[PDB]
Design a protein around this ligand. Sequence first.
Ligand SMILES: O=C(O)CCC(=O)C(=O)O
Ligand SMILES: [Cl-]
Ligand SMILES: [Cl-]
Ligand SMILES: [Fe+3]
Ligand SMILES: [Mg+2]
Ligand SMILES: [Mg+2]
Ligand SMILES: [Mg+2]
Lengths: 19, 219
Amino acid sequence: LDLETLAPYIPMDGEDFQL
Amino acid sequence: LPALKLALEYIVPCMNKHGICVVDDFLGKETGQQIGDEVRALHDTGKFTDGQLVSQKSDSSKDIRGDKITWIEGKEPGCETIGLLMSSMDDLIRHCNGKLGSYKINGRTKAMVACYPGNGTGYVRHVDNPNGDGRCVTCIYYLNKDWDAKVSGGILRIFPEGKAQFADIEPKFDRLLFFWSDRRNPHEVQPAYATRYAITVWYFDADERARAKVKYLTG
Ligand SMILES: O=C(O)CCC(=O)C(=O)O
Ligand SMILES: [Cl-]
Ligand SMILES: [Cl-]
Ligand SMILES: [Fe+3]
Ligand SMILES: [Mg+2]
Ligand SMILES: [Mg+2]
Ligand SMILES: [Mg+2]
């Protein structure tokens, strides 16, 4: 079973915050 | 509480020994209630939409996770206390630089404000980041003032790898939780029978997140 099919979505480009 | 001591003397050793760390009474009652009012206002004004998964195939998302969410940057009008929560989480993480495993934490997601609207909704057992998408630390703040988990359910059960007992986290008001996001911590949100709210950010490891972005940008 592909665990990515259960994992919570996050945006993959354009939306990361830099600390 | 002062970030340096909380980070170095509690969060860091807890995370490196157990991969899970609970900080109760994180912001105090006044701020915790202001966060709850801001979340309830997002709910009341129709901002939440069905929670989604990293990869979708034939199944309905609602057979996997029953919550409804919105993403918050922290500067939006009416979200100022959520933004203070995020700044407070970020302050702890910056004080942990280079001491949480071998990670180099440089960034994070927006905040996921999430609601399980009672009715037995929950989240099946899963790993937050099973395939190297960059997430190394899951940080969750709970804001449910009168929650009685014995009747309303909604317990986050984590199954930390290598341990003789699982970790049951009630979604207690003003509780802050950290855990490793990778396969060391499979977890489930057990069915909730009252409206349950939590706010999550995920912190990124720089090198893993760069590899994940390269994969996405090359197809
Ligand atoms: O709300 C919680 O306790 C956990 C939520 C969760 O596991 C998720 O959204 O990935
Ligand atoms: Cl560990
Ligand atoms: Cl770091
Ligand atoms: Fe999760
Ligand atoms: Mg909004
Ligand atoms: Mg949104
Ligand atoms: Mg129950």
